[PDB]
Design an enzyme around this catalytic site. Structure first.
Site, short mmCIF file in Angstrom:
data_model
loop_
_atom_site.label_atom_id
_atom_site.label_comp_id
_atom_site.label_asym_id
_atom_site.label_seq_id
_atom_site.Cartn_x
_atom_site.Cartn_y
_atom_site.Cartn_z
CB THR D 1 22.31 -110.12 -26.47
OG1 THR D 1 22.79 -108.80 -26.74
CG2 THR D 1 22.46 -110.98 -27.72
CG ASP D 17 18.43 -108.95 -29.28
OD1 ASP D 17 18.54 -107.77 -28.86
OD2 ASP D 17 19.27 -109.83 -29.02
NE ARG D 19 16.42 -102.77 -26.19
CZ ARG D 19 15.46 -102.60 -25.29
NH1 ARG D 19 15.58 -103.12 -24.07
NH2 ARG D 19 14.38 -101.89 -25.59
CE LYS D 33 22.51 -107.75 -30.28
NZ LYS D 33 21.54 -107.72 -29.15
N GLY D 47 27.59 -111.28 -25.65
CA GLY D 47 28.69 -110.97 -24.74
C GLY D 47 29.18 -109.56 -24.96
CB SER D 129 20.77 -110.75 -21.37
OG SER D 129 19.63 -110.21 -20.74
CG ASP D 166 16.83 -109.53 -21.27
OD1 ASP D 166 17.12 -108.32 -21.29
OD2 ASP D 166 17.64 -110.41 -20.94
CB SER D 169 16.47 -109.05 -25.17
OG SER D 169 17.58 -109.87 -24.86
CL CL Z 1 15.75 -101.61 -29.17
#
Ligand code: CL
Ligand code: CL
Ligand code: CL
Ligand code: CL
Ligand code: CL
Ligand code: CL
Ligand code: CL
Ligand code: K
Ligand code: K
Ligand code: K
Lengths: 199, 204, 248, 219, 243, 238, 244, 196, 230
Positions: D1, D17, D19, D33, D47, D129, D166, D169
C-alpha cells in the site's frame, strides 16, 4: 534523539533535534520535540514517540487545571512532579524521558530530569540516544553563569556534535528561551549549524 | 495453519441478472475425512446466501449467530435484508472478535430484494469487506480458485453458462487441494427460481 | 428516601398485590382483543384504538406482532410496555433457536416472559408491565395453540378467550357459540366479527377499526398473514348481510 | 500500500493505490483507501485493512456527531487528536497508519498518525509499504506553495512510483483534492496498467459438467 | 386551575397535575436569596460583566469576596445565587472546559460550555435524589468566528445567547431597562457597553456606588483575555459617567 | 416527632435526636468506673443478672496486652467495636512491632463512629466505652460515646446512676496521682458502690475489675480473683 | 425562620422561598457551640478558643479544638466536634495529596477551596446530611504572607483579617474591629485574643472554661504549633486584669 | 486411548464403546461404561481427557433431564446434539476448554434414527456411521466397504464384529471388551457385550 | 457521595392510569405550539420560537434540530428534556450507521427513541420526559412523519399539531390538509396552522421551520422564512 536543557539567571534554554527514525529509516526529519506544558513551562521529548506525546498532553492538561485552581502560573517544580508521577506510575508500560524546564516567579529558571521516574534538578541536562556522545563535551565546555547567548551556543554546539555522531539524531536544531518576558522560539538550519572536525 | 485444520473451499460468481455460489462438501480433520455431506452454504433468506470456509466450528457458529441477528433485523425492520446490509452485519459480527477471531472467511452471494441487482462479496476473518463485479473466493485453495476464475469468467453470463463456468472453476481447483473435495454443491440464484446442484466431483 | 417509595412489590392485608390489580384496570380501558382456536388454524382479532383521518398507516399492523416463524401475538394495555415485552419475546425465541436449532415450543415462550413479569411483582421496587397478551402459534408437540398472559405473570391455554374492553361480555358470548372440536377457521372468522360487532363502541364496525391475522399450516410451513382491507370488508359485510336475513 | 499527502497553496491533496493483498496474493484490485471523515476532511489508510476501515468510520461518525452538536465545520486538528488517543489506548494492536488532510478556518493541514498513537504535522508525507518511493519523489520535487495542477501531478507521480516499485502496491491511483471551496474526490485519477484483453475463450457448452443431483425452487 | 399540587411534587423533581416542576421553580427563588444583582451587556467589540460587591465588615478580606470567576483564558463568568452552589458550578465548568480541549484540541466555544452545564443541570431536574443548584451562570467570551458572546444557563436547564442579560433580585427591573437601551441603536463601543452595564445597576438599585462597591469583568476583540478591572480602572469609568 | 427517625435529619434546634436516643442506651446499662494513677489504670464495673438463675453479664473485655475496655449499652455494638479495636491493635503490632498508642486508637474510634451518623439508613453505635491503657505517655483513661466524640479523662463513670460515682471521683481526683495500686482499686470500688441502692452492696459475683499499668499487662479478675480487693473494706456510710 | 413537616427533612428538597433548611439547621449547631476565634496579624495568624469544661474529671488538654492539618496549616473548629474531626481528617488527606502530586506545601486558599467542595457535597442529597460545624484555616509563609480562611456548613469559604464562630460571634467581631491587626505583631495579638475570649465568655450561663491558643507565623518559622504555657498565662493574666 | 463407534440403520442406531479405564500403563477397569443415558432414546458416548469427560457428559445429561421435567417431554436427538455443541463451543475460547470427543445416538418419533459426530473443537456433523479414537483409522475403511443405508440389525452387529476383530489384530492397544447397545422405536436395549 | 433511588416514581393508580405520564402530557400540552405535515414529495416541520423579548439573540439556540443527513426534530414541552432526546437520537442514528452502513429508517429511529422514553416511566428515581417529539425523515424515496410522547408510544401521521391549541390545530388540518401536496405548499399550511395559535405578529425571527426531502434535511434560513410570510 538529542535533547538538552540549560539554566541561566533570567530563565532557561531548551534544545532539541528534528529527527524521528524507525530503525534505519527516518520518518520525520523535521520534528519539534519541544512541547509546552504551560505558558512558561516547556518539556523536551525522548523515547517512544507515542508514549512521549501521550505524557506531554496529559501533563499540559493537569497543569492547565492546576493553574486555574491556584489562579497562578504553575511552579516549574509542580510541572516536573506531574511528569515524574506519570512516568513512575507506568515505568514498565511507558518508555520516555522528558526534560522539563521553565520559569516561575518563586524560583526563577529551573531544569528538571525525570528519566526513569526520578526527580533531579541540574544546572543543565541532556537526554536521548545522542547524549552518550556528548557527556565528555558538556563536562569540559560548561562554565557557571553563562549569559542567555552563551547558553544557546552551548546547547546548539553539544546537540550539533551529537547529531553528527548519532545515527538516530539529525535534522535541524530547535531552540527555545524562557524568560520572565516571554518565549523565544528559533530554529537552526544545516547551513547555520556549527562546524568542527568532521573526518 | 489454523485455517488448514478443516480446509474447505467457497466461491461466488456474477452474471446477467443472476449470481452463483458453490462450496465443497468435505468435513475432515487433518489426516482423515469424516463426512461427505457437510454444509457450508447457508440461506440468509430467499435470494440471498452465505458461504463459509475455514474452521468447521466457527463456520457453524458464525452461521448460527448471524441468523440470530438476521431474524431480529427482519422482525424489527419490516423488510427483508439488503445484500450490502448483510455484508456490514457480518463485518460487525467478525470485528467484535478482533483479538480472538472466528477462523472463517465468509462469502455473500445474492440478488437485491426489490431492485433485482446482483451482489457478491467476501470478507476477512476479522471482517473486512471486499466487493467485486466478477468473483470472490475463500478457502485453503485460494490460489487455485483465483487461477481458474481469472481465466474462465466473462462479463455477461446467462444462468445456463454461469453454472458451467463456476462448476469447472470449483471442480479443478478442488482437485489440486488435498483438504477440499468429496463433492461440490452449486446454487444458481435467479429472480424466478433457485437451482441447487451437486456435481460428479472426485471422491479421493 | 423511603418517604418517596411507593412500595410497588408489597402485600395487601387481604393477600393480594395492589399494583398488579391496578394494572388490570389499564387493560380494561384498552382495545378489545380476542383469540379463537380452530381445527385447521388459529386467529387474532383486535380493535384498533389508533383511528383518525390523519394517521398515515405505515406498518402492517397496530396491535399484532410477529414474534417467531411459527408464532404471533396481540396486545392490550400500555403500548410502550407492550413494545418492550414483544421485543423481549423476539429475543427469547431467537436464543432458543440459537441453542437447539429448532423453533421454540409455544408454551415455553409464554413461560419465559411470564417469569420476567412475575419478577417485576416480587423484587426491584418497580411498576409491573400494564399489558395483557394473546399468543397464537404452532409447534411440533401440541399443534395449533392459544395462550393468555396477565400482568401478574400468570398464563393459561385457551380454545377461545378475550382481553381488553368489555372482556367479560365477549367471553360469555364466545362460551355459547364456540363448538369444541368442530370449529373451522371460516367459522372462527365469522365468530370473531360477530363478537366484535356487539362488543365494540362505534356500533356499525369498519375495516379501519378492526385488525385480524390468521395462522395456518400450509405445505409443511407455518403461514402468518395480517388480513388486507379488502378481505376485512368482505368479512364485515357477510355478517351485515346475515343481519338483514334475521327478520320475517 | 502506497499513500501520500501533499500541501499546496489552495489546499491539500491525498493519494492512494487500489491494491489489497491477502497473504502474498492479490484479493482486491479496486479498493478505496481514501476515507470520508468530514465533507472537507479525508484520511488515507494503510496497515490492517479492517483496522483502517473501522478506525476511520469511527472517527467519521464521531466527527459528524461533533459537527452536529457544535453546528460548525469540524477541525482537522480535532480529528487527529481523536485518532491518536483511541489508537494509543490499544498500544499499536490496531494496525492503522493514516494520512489525514483537511481544510479549516485555520487553513489546509496535513497530519500523519501511527498505530501506536504518535502523530506529526508536515507539508508532505507518505506511509505504507511503498512509502520509500513516494517520499523520494516528494523530497525530490516538492516546492512550497505549489499550484494545484503541479501538486496533482507530483502526487500522482509519487504514488505511481510506489505502484511499480512495490509488490504490495498496485492498481490505479486515487486522488482527493481539498480546497476551501470544495473537496473533489477523483477515483481512478490515473491508471498505469490496463490489461482487459484475453486471447482464449474458455466457455463451456451446457452439459459438459456432470451433475448427480438437481433441485429447483420456484419463486 | 393554575398552581395545583398532588403527591410529592412539591418535594421532589416530579410532575404536578399542570405539568410543572416546583423544586425547579424554587431554585430560581434561591438565586434571589443571595441578595445580589448581576448584569451583562454585549457590544460590537466587547462583552461586559457587572455585579454589586457587598462587604459587610472590614474584618473580611475584600480581595477574596467575588462572584467574578475565570474558567478559561478567553472565557469568564459571573455567578448569582447561593455562593457555595456557585463555586461548585465554576469548578465543574473549568473541568468541562479543560476536558474539551484534551479531547478535541481546540478552545471551548462560549455556547458549548453553556450547553454542557445546562445538560448537567438537567440531570438534577430529572433525578429525584438530588436538588437543583440554586445559582445562575452568565458566561462571556469571544468566539474566533462569531464575535463576542454572552450566554446564560438555568437551574432548570435552559440556556440561551443574549445581547444583554440580568440575573438575581433586581433581574426583572433591569431587563426592562436593557430593553429600552437596545431599541435606541447606540454606537456600542467599549465605554458605551461598560457604562450601559454600570448605569443599569446604578439605577435599579439607586446607589451611585464607590469603585469598591462593584466588580467589572471585560472581554474585548483586540484583547480576548478575561480581566477583572480592580479599583483604579473602575474609578476611571465612574468619573467618566459624571462628566 | 419527625426529626428523630433518621441520623441524616437535623432538628430545627440544631441537634440530631437519633444520636441522643443512642446515648440513652448507655445510661440504661449497669454502671462502670475508670480511674488512673501515675503508674496504673484501673477499670471497675458492675456485673448484672436478669434473673438469679442466670449468670452475670461480661462487662470488661480484652483488646490488647496494654489496652482494656469496659462496656455500657448494646452487647452486639460493644462486641463490634471491641473487634475493631482488636484488629487495629493487631495491625499496629504486625506492621510496626510496637503497641498502638492509646491516643491514636481512640481517634480511630472517633473516625469510625462518625461515619454511620452521617449516612442514611445507618445508625449510631449504641454503646459507650471506658478505655484503660498504658504506653509511652503513661496510663490513660478514655471515654467514647454513641456520638463520635471522645474524652481524655482523669477518672470517669458511665451507665445507670453513674452521677453518684462521678461526684465521688470529683472529690478525690487529687488523691489518685500518688495512690498505691491497692488504694486505687478501692477508690474505684467505692465509687461504683455509690451507684447501688442502700439495700445492696458489692459482692464477689457482681464485681469485675481490670488493671493495666507499668507493672503488668491487662488482666481481668472476676470471681475468686476479686475477693482480695473487696476484703479490707470501709463500711457503707450515710 | 423555619418551615415544618415537609420542606426541612431532606437536603435534596428546596423550600417554597428557595431555602435549604437542613443546611440552616446544621448552621444552628455551630451557633450553639462555644466561641472560636482567629485573626490575621502583620507576621502570621493567631487562633483562640473557649473550651467549656463539662466536668472537672476531664484532662487539661482534652477535646482539642485546635488541629494540625498540615505542618504549616492550622484548624480552629466550632460545632459538632465529631464532624469537626472528620473534616480535619479530610483536610489532612487533601494537603497530603497535593504534596504527593505537586511536591510542595499546599497554598491555604486552595486547601480551603478543596475542603469546601467536600462540605458542599453533603448539602445536595437525601442520602447524607450536611456537616454540623464551621472551621477556620490559617497559615504563614514568606511568599504568600499571612492568610486566614473560614468555611461554614453550606460550603462557603472567604478570606479574613478577623473572624469568629460560635455562641457570641457578634460580640467577638465588634471587639476585633477595634484592633489594628494590619500593623500588629502576632506576639501582641495573642494578648488581645485572650481578652476577647474572656469578654465573650458568659460566666453566669456557662459554668467554666479553658483557653486554647495557636501559633502560625514568623516566630514559629512558618510552622503551626501551640502557644507555650509561659506566653499563654501572660495573656490570661492580661485578660483577667483588663476586664475591669 | 479409547474407542467409540456408531452405525445407523433404516429404523435403528447401533452403538459400541470399549470398557477400558486406563492409567499410564495399567488397565484399572475391565468393565467401565462410556455410555450416558440422556433420554429414553438418547445415548451420549464420550471420550478424551480423564476428568473432563465425565464432568461434561453428566452436565449435559442433567440438563436434558432438566428439560424433561420442566416441559413433560424429552428433547429430540437433533436438539440434544445442538445443545451439547453449544456448550462445548462456548468453552473453546475460554481459559479452561474441554478436550472431549463425543458421539450422540438417538431415535426421533418423526425424523427417525440419528447419529451425530462431534470434535473437541465442537464441530457437529450427522453421519450414517462414525467412529472415535485411533481405532477409527483402522475401522472406517471397513465401514466404508460393507455399509449400505438399508443394513439390517443382524448384519449391523456382524459388521461391528468385523470392526472389533480388526482392533484385536492390528491395533497396538489392548481393548478386549466392548459395550453394545441398540436404540430404536422401543428405546435403548442392552445387548450381549462382545469379549475376546 | 451519592446513590440513586431504585424505586419507580410512576405507579398505577386505582383507576388504572399512570398519573405521572398524564402529568407529563400536561407539560407538552402547555408548551409552545408545533406542527408537522407529510406532503407527498417531502416533510415540513414548524414551531413557535417567540422568546417574548427583544433582548434574546434569536440566532443562538434552535428548536428545529437535525439528527442526521435525512432526519429532523421538533418538540412541544420542555427545552432541557428535548435536548437529551436529541443527543440520544443522534447517537442512535450513528450506532445504526456504524453497524449497517445505511441511513437509518425513520420508523427505526422513532422506535429506538421511544424506547428511551419508556425507560423513564419505569426506572427508579426518575420522572418521565415532559416532551412530545415530531420526527421527520426520508428513506426508500418516501416521506415519513412520526410522533413520540412521554408514554413511550409512537404514532405515524400525515399531518398533526401539538402544544398550545393542539385540538384546534388538528381540526384545522383535518379541513385544510389534503394528500398529494407539494413541499412548498406544505410550508404555507404549516405556517397557517401556526398562525391559528400565535398571538402577535409573525416575523422570520418569531418562528422556526425545517424541511426534509430527497436532498436531505435542512433548517430554512431567516431569508427563506420571510418569503413565505407573504
Ligand atoms: Cl492490483
Ligand atoms: Cl550532564
Ligand atoms: Cl534519556
Ligand atoms: Cl424461528
Ligand atoms: Cl434566571
Ligand atoms: Cl450494659
Ligand atoms: Cl431505594
Ligand atoms: K476513532
Ligand atoms: K422538634
Ligand atoms: K518564614
Amino acid at each position: 534523539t538529542t535533547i538538552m536543557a540549560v539554566e541561566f539567571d533570567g530563565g532557561v534554554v531548551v534544545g532539541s533535534d528534528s529527527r524521528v527514525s524507525a530503525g534505519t529509516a527516518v520518518v520525520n526529519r523535521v520534528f519539534d520535540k519541544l512541547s509546552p506544558l504551560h505558558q512558561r513551562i516547556f518539556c523536551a521529548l525522548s523515547g517512544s514517540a507515542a508514549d512521549a506525546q501521550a505524557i506531554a498532553d496529559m501533563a499540559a492538561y493537569q497543569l492547565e487545571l492546576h493553574g486555574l485552581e491556584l489562579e497562578e502560573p504553575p511552579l516549574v517544580l509542580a510541572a516536573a512532579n506531574v511528569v515524574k508521577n506519570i512516568s513512575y506510575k507506568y515505568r514498565e508500560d511507558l518508555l520516555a524521558h522528558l526534560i522539563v524546564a521553565g520559569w516561575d516567579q518563586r524560583e526563577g529558571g529551573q531544569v528538571y530530569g525525570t528519566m526513569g521516574g526520578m526527580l533531579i534538578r541540574q544546572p543543565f541536562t541532556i537526554g536521548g540516544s545522542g547524549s552518550s556522545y556528548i557527556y565528555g563535551y558538556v563536562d569540559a565546555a560548561y562554565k557557571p553563569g553563562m549569559t542567555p547567548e552563551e547558553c544557546r551556543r552551548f546547547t546548539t554546539n553539544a546537540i550539533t556534535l551529537a547529531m553528527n555522531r548519532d545515527g538516530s539524531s539529525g535534522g535541524v536544531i530547535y531552540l527555545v528561551t524562557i524568560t520572565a518576558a516571554g518565549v523565544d522560539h528559533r530554529v537552526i538550519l544545516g547551513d547555520e549549524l556549527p562546524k568542527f572536525y568532521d573526518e | 495453519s489454523i485455517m488448514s485444520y478443516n480446509g474447505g473451499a467457497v466461491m461466488a460468481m456474477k452474471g446477467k441478472n443472476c449470481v452463483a455460489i458453490a462450496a465443497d462438501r468435505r468435513f475432515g480433520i487433518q489426516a482423515q475425512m469424516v463426512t461427505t455431506d457437510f454444509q457450508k452454504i447457508f440461506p440468509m433468506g430467499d435470494r440471498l446466501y452465505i458461504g463459509l470456509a475455514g474452521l468447521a466450528t466457527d463456520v457453524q457458529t458464525v452461521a448460527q449467530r448471524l441468523k440470530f441477528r438476521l431474524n431480529l433485523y427482519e422482525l424489527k425492520e419490516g423488510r427483508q435484508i439488503k445484500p450490502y446490509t448483510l455484508m456490514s452485519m457480518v463485518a460487525n459480527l467478525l470485528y467484535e472478535k478482533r483479538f480472538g477471531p472466528y477462523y472463517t472467511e465468509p462469502v455473500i452471494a445474492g440478488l437485491d430484494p426489490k431492485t433485482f441487482k446482483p451482489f457478491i462479496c467476501s470478507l476477512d476473518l476479522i471482517g473486512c469487506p471486499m466487493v467485486t463485479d466478477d468473483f470472490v473466493v475463500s478457502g485453503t485453495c485460494s490460489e487455485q480458485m483465483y487461477g481458474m476464475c481469472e481465466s474462465l469468467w466473462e462479463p455477461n453470463m446467462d444462468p445456463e453458462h454461469l453454472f458451467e463456468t463456476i462448476s469447472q472453476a470449483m471442480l479443478n481447483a478442488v482437485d489440486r487441494d488435498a483438504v477440499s473435495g468429496m463433492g461440490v454443491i452449486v446454487h444458481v440464484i435467479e429472480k424466478d427460481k433457485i437451482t441447487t446442484r451437486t456435481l460428479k466431483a472426485r471422491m479421493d | 428516601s423511603r418517604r418517596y417509595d411507593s412500595r410497588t412489590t408489597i402485600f395487601s392485608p387481604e393477600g393480594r398485590l395492589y399494583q398488579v390489580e391496578y394494572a388490570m384496570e389499564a387493560i380494561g380501558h384498552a382495545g378489545t382483543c380476542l383469540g379463537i382456536l380452530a381445527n385447521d388454524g388459529v386467529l387474532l382479532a383486535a380493535e384498533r384504538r389508533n383511528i383518525h383521518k390523519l394517521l398515515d398507516e405505515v406498518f402492517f399492523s397496530e396491535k399484532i406482532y410477529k414474534l417467531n416463524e411459527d408464532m404471533a401475538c396481540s396486545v392490550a394495555g400500555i403500548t410502550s410496555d407492550a413494545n418492550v415485552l414483544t421485543n423481549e419475546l423476539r429475543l427469547i425465541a431467537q436464543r432458543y433457536l440459537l441453542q437447539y436449532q429448532e423453533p421454540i415450543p409455544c408454551e415455553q415462550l409464554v413461560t419465559a416472559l411470564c417469569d420476567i413479569k412475575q419478577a417485576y411483582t416480587q423484587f426491584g421496587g418497580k411498576r409491573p408491565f400494564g399489558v395483557s397478551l394473546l399468543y397464537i402459534g404452532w409447534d411440533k408437540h401440541y399443534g395449533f395453540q392459544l395462550y393468555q398472559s396477565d400482568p401478574s405473570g400468570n398464563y393459561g391455554g385457551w380454545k377461545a378467550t378475550c382481553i381488553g374492553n368489555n372482556s367479560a361480555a365477549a367471553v360469555s358470548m364466545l362460551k355459547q357459540d364456540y363448538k369444541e372440536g368442530e370449529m373451522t377457521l371460516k367459522s372462527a372468522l365469522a365468530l370473531a366479527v360477530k363478537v366484535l360487532n356487539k362488543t365494540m363502541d362505534v356500533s356499525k364496525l369498519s375495516a379501519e377499526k378492526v385488525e385480524i391475522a390468521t395462522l395456518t399450516r400450509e405445505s409443511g410451513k407455518t403461514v402468518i398473514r395480517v388480513l388486507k382491507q379488502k378481505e376485512v370488508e368482505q368479512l364485515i359485510k357477510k355478517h351485515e348481510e346475515e343481519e338483514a336475513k334475521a327478520e320475517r | 500500500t502506497t499513500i501520500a499527502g501533499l500541501v499546496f497553496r489552495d489546499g491539500v491533496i491525498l493519494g492512494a493505490d487500489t491494491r489489497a493483498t491477502n497473504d502474498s496474493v492479490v484479493a482486491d484490485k479496486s479498493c478505496e483507501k481514501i476515507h470520508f471523515i468530514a465533507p472537507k476532511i479525508y484520511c488515507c489508510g494503510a496497515g490492517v485493512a479492517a483496522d483502517t476501515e473501522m478506525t476511520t468510520r469511527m472517527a467519521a461518525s464521531k466527527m459528524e456527531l461533533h459537527a452536529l452538536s457544535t453546528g460548525r465545520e469540524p477541525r482537522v486538528a480535532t480529528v487527529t487528536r481523536i485518532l491518536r488517543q483511541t489508537l494509543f489506548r490499544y498500544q499499536g494492536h490496531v494496525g492503522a497508519s493514516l494520512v489525514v488532510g483537511g481544510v479549516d478556518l485555520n487553513g489546509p493541514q496535513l497530519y500523519e498518525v501511527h498505530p501506536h498513537g504518535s502523530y506529526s504535522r508536515l507539508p508532505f508525507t507518505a506511509l505504507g509499504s511503498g512509502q520509500g518511493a513516494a517520499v523520494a519523489l516528494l523530497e525530490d520535487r516538492f516546492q512550497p506553495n505549489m499550484t494545484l495542477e503541479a501538486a496533482q501531478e507530483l502526487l500522482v507521480e509519487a504514488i505511481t512510483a510506489g505502484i511499480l516499485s512495490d509488490l504490495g502496491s498496485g492498481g490505479n491511483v486515487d486522488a482527493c483534492v481539498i480546497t476551501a471551496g470544495g473537496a473533489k474526490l477523483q477515483r481512478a485519477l490515473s491508471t498505469p496498467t490496463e490489461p482487459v484483453q484475453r486471447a482464449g475463450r474458455y466457455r463451456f457448452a451446457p452439459g459438459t459438467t456432470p451433475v448427480l443431483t438437481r433441485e429447483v425452487r420456484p419463486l | 386551575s393554575r398552581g395545583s399540587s398532588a403527591g410529592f411534587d412539591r418535594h421532589i423533581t416530579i410532575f404536578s397535575p399542570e405539568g410543572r416542576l416546583y423544586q425547579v421553580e424554587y431554585a430560581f427563588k434561591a438565586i434571589n436569596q443571595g441578595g445580589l444583582t448581576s448584569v451583562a451587556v454585549r457590544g460590537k467589540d466587547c462583552a461586559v460583566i457587572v455585579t454589586q460587591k457587598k462587604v459587610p465588615d472590614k474584618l473580611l478580606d475584600s480581595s477574596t469576596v467575588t462572584h467574578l470567576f475565570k474558567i478559561t483564558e478567553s472565557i469568564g463568568c459571573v455567578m448569582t445565587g447561593m455562593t457555595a452552589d456557585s463555586r461548585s458550578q465554576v469548578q465543574r465548568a473549568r473541568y468541562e472546559a479543560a476536558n474539551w480541549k484534551y479531547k478535541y484540541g481546540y478552545e471551548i466555544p462560549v455556547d458549548m460550555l453553556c450547553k454542557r452545564i445546562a445538560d448537567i443541570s438537567q440531570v438534577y431536574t430529572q433525578n429525584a435524589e438530588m436538588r437543583p443548584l440554586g445559582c445562575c451562570m452568565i458566561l462571556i467570551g469571544i468566539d474566533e468566528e462569531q464575535g463576542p458572546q454572552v450566554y446564560k444557563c438555568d437551574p432548570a436547564g435552559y440556556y440561551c445567547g443574549f445581547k444583554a442579560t440580568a440575573a438575581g433580585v433586581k433581574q426583572t427591573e433591569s431587563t426592562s431597562f436593557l430593553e429600552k437601551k437596545v431599541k435606541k441603536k447606540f454606537d456600542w463601543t467599549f465605554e458605551q457597553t461598560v457604562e450601559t452595564a454600570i448605569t443599569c445597576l446604578s439605577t435599579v438599585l439607586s446607589i451611585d456606588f464607590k469603585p469598591s462597591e462593584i466588580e467589572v469583568g471585560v472581554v474585548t476583540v483586540e484583547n480576548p483575555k478575561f480581566r477583572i478591572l480592580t479599583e483604579a480602572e473602575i474609578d476611571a469609568h465612574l468619573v467618566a459617567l459624571a462628566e | 416527632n419527625q426529626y428523630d427517625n433518621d441520623v441524616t435529619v437535623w432538628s430545627p434546634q440544631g441537634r440530631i435526636h437519633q444520636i441522643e436516643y443512642a446515648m440513652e442506651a448507655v445510661k440504661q446499662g449497669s454502671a462502670t468506673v475508670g480511674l488512673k494513677s501515675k503508674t496504673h489504670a484501673v477499670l471497675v464495673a458492675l456485673k448484672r443478672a436478669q434473673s438469679e438463675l442466670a449468670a452475670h453479664q461480661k462487662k470488661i473485655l480484652h483488646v490488647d496486652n496494654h489496652i482494656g475496655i469496659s462496656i455500657a449499652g448494646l452487647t452486639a455494638d460493644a462486641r463490634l467495636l471491641c473487634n475493631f479495636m482488636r484488629q487495629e491493635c493487631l495491625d499496629s503490632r504486625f506492621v510496626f512491632d510496637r503497641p498502638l498508642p492509646v491516643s491514636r486508637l481512640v481517634s480511630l474510634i472517633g473516625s469510625k463512629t462518625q461515619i454511620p451518623t452521617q449516612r442514611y439508613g445507618r445508625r449510631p453505635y449504641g454503646v459507650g466505652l471506658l478505655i484503660a491503657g498504658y504506653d509511652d505517655m503513661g496510663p490513660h483513661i478514655f471515654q467514647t460515646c454513641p456520638s463520635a466524640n471522645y474524652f481524655d479523662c482523669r477518672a470517669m463513670s458511665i451507665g445507670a446512676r453513674s452521677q453518684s460515682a462521678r461526684t465521688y471521683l470529683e472529690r478525690h481526683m487529687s488523691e489518685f496521682m500518688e495512690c498505691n495500686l491497692d488504694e486505687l482499686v478501692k477508690h474505684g470500688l467505692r465509687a461504683l458502690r455509690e451507684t447501688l441502692p442502700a439495700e445492696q452492696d458489692l459482692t464477689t459475683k457482681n464485681v469485675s475489675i481490670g488493671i493495666v499499668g507499668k507493672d503488668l499487662e491487662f488482666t481481668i479478675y472476676d470471681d475468686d480473683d476479686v475477693s482480695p480487693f473487696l476484703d479490707g473494706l470501709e463500711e457503707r456510710p450515710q | 425562620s423555619s418551615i415544618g413537616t415537609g420542606y426541612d427533612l431532606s437536603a435534596s428538597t428546596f423550600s417554597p422561598d428557595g431555602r435549604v433548611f437542613q443546611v440552616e439547621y446544621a448552621m444552628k449547631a455551630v451557633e450553639n457551640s462555644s466561641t472560636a476565634i482567629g485573626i490575621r496579624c502583620k507576621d502570621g495568624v493567631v487562633f483562640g478558643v473557649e473550651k467549656l469544661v463539662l466536668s472537672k474529671l476531664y484532662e487539661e488538654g482534652s477535646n482539642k479544638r485546635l488541629f494540625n492539618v498540615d505542618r504549616h496549616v492550622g484548624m480552629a473548629v466550632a460545632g459538632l466536634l465529631a464532624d469537626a474531626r472528620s473534616l480535619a481528617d479530610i483536610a489532612r488527606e487533601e494537603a497530603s495529596n497535593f504534596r504527593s502530586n505537586f511536591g510542595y506545601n499546599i497554598p491555604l486558599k486552595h486547601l480551603a477551596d478543596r475542603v469546601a467542595m467536600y462540605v458542599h457535597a453533603y448539602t445536595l442529597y437525601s442520602a447524607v446530611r450536611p456537616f454540623g460545624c464551621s472551621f477556620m484555616l490559617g497559615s504563614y509563609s514568606a511568599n504568600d504572607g499571612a492568610q486566614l480562611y473560614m468555611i461554614d456548613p453550606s460550603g462557603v469559604s472567604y478570606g479574613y483579617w478577623g473572624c469568629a464562630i460560635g455562641k457570641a460571634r457578634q460580640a467577638a467581631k465588634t471587639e476585633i474591629e477595634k484592633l489594628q491587626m494590619k500593623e500588629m505583631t502576632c506576639r501582641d495579638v495573642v494578648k488581645e485574643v485572650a481578652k476577647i475570649i474572656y469578654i465573650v465568655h458568659d460566666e453566669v450561663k456557662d459554668k467554666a472554661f479553658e483557653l486554647e491558643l495557636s501559633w502560625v507565623g514568623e516566630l514559629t518559622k512558618g510552622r503551626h504549633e501551640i502557644v507555650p504555657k509561659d506566653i499563654r498565662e501572660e495573656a490570661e493574666k492580661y485578660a483577667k486584669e483588663s476586664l475591669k | 486411548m479409547e474407542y467409540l463407534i456408531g452405525i445407523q440403520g433404516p429404523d435403528y442406531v447401533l452403538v459400541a464403546s470399549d470398557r477400558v479405564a486406563a492409567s499410564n500403563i495399567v488397565q484399572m477397569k475391565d468393565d467401565h461404561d462410556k455410555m450416558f443415558k440422556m433420554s429414553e432414546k438418547i445415548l451420549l458416548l464420550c471420550v478424551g481427557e480423564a476428568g473432563d469427560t465425565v464432568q461434561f457428559a453428566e452436565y449435559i445429561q442433567k440438563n436434558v433431564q432438566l428439560y424433561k421435567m420442566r416441559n413433560g417431554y424429552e428433547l429430540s436427538p437433533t436438539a440434544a446434539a445442538n445443545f451439547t455443541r453449544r456448550n462445548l463451543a462456548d468453552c473453546l475460547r475460554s481459559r479452561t476448554p474441554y478436550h472431549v470427543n463425543l458421539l450422540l445416538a438417538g431415535y426421533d418419533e418423526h425424523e427417525g434414527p440419528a447419529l451425530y459426530y462431534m470434535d473437541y473443537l465442537a464441530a457437529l456433523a450427522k453421519a450414517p456411521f462414525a467412529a472415535h479414537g485411533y481405532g477409527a483409522f483402522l475401522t472406517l475403511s471397513i465401514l466404508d466397504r460393507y455399509y449400505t443405508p438399508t443394513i439390517s440389525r443382524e448384519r449391523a452387529v456382524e459388521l461391528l464384529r468385523k470392526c472389533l476383530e480388526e482392533l484385536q489384530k492390528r491395533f497396538i492397544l489392548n481393548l478386549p471388551t466392548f459395550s453394545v447397545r441398540v436404540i430404536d422405536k422401543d428405546g435403548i436395549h442392552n445387548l450381549e457385550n462382545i469379549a475376546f | 457521595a451519592k446513590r440513586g433511588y431504585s424505586f419507580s416514581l410512576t405507579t398505577f393508580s386505582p383507576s388504572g392510569k399512570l398519573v405521572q405520564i398524564e402529568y407529563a402530557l400536561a407539560a407538552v400540552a402547555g408548551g409552545a405550539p408545533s406542527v408537522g405535515i407529510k406532503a407527498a414529495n417531502g416533510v415540513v416541520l414548524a414551531t413557535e420560537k417567540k422568546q417574548k423579548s427583544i433582548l434574546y439573540d434569536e440566532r443562538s439556540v434552535h428548536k428545529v434540530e437535525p439528527i442526521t443527513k435525512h432526519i429532523g426534530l421538533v418538540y412541544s414541552g420542555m427545552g432541557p428534556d428535548y435536548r437529551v432526546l436529541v443527543h440520544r437520537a443522534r447517537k442512535l442514528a450513528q450506532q445504526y450507521y456504524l453497524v449497517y452502513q445505511e441511513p437509518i429508517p425513520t420508523a427505526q429511529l422513532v422506535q429506538r427513541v421511544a424506547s428511551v422514553m419508556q425507560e423513564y416511566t419505569q426506572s427508579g428515581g426518575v420522572r418521565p420526559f415532559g416532551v412530545s417529539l415530531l420526527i421527520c425523515g426520508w428513506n426508500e424515496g418516501r416521506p415519513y412523519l412520526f410522533q413520540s410522547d412521554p408514554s413511550g408510544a409512537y404514532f405515524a401521521w400525515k399531518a398533526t399539531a401539538m402544544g398550545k391549541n393542539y385540538v384546534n390545530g388538528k381540526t384545522f388540518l383535518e379541513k385544510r390538509y389534503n394528500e398529494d401536496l407539494e413541499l412548498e405548499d406544505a410550508i404555507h399550511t404549516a405556517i397557517l396552522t401556526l398562525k391559528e395559535s400565535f398571538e402577535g405578529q409573525m416575523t422570520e425571527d418569531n418562528i422556526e421551520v425545517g424541511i426534509c426531502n430527497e436532498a436531505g434535511f435542512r433548517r430554512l434560513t431567516p431569508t427563506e422564512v420571510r418569503d413565505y410570510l407573504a
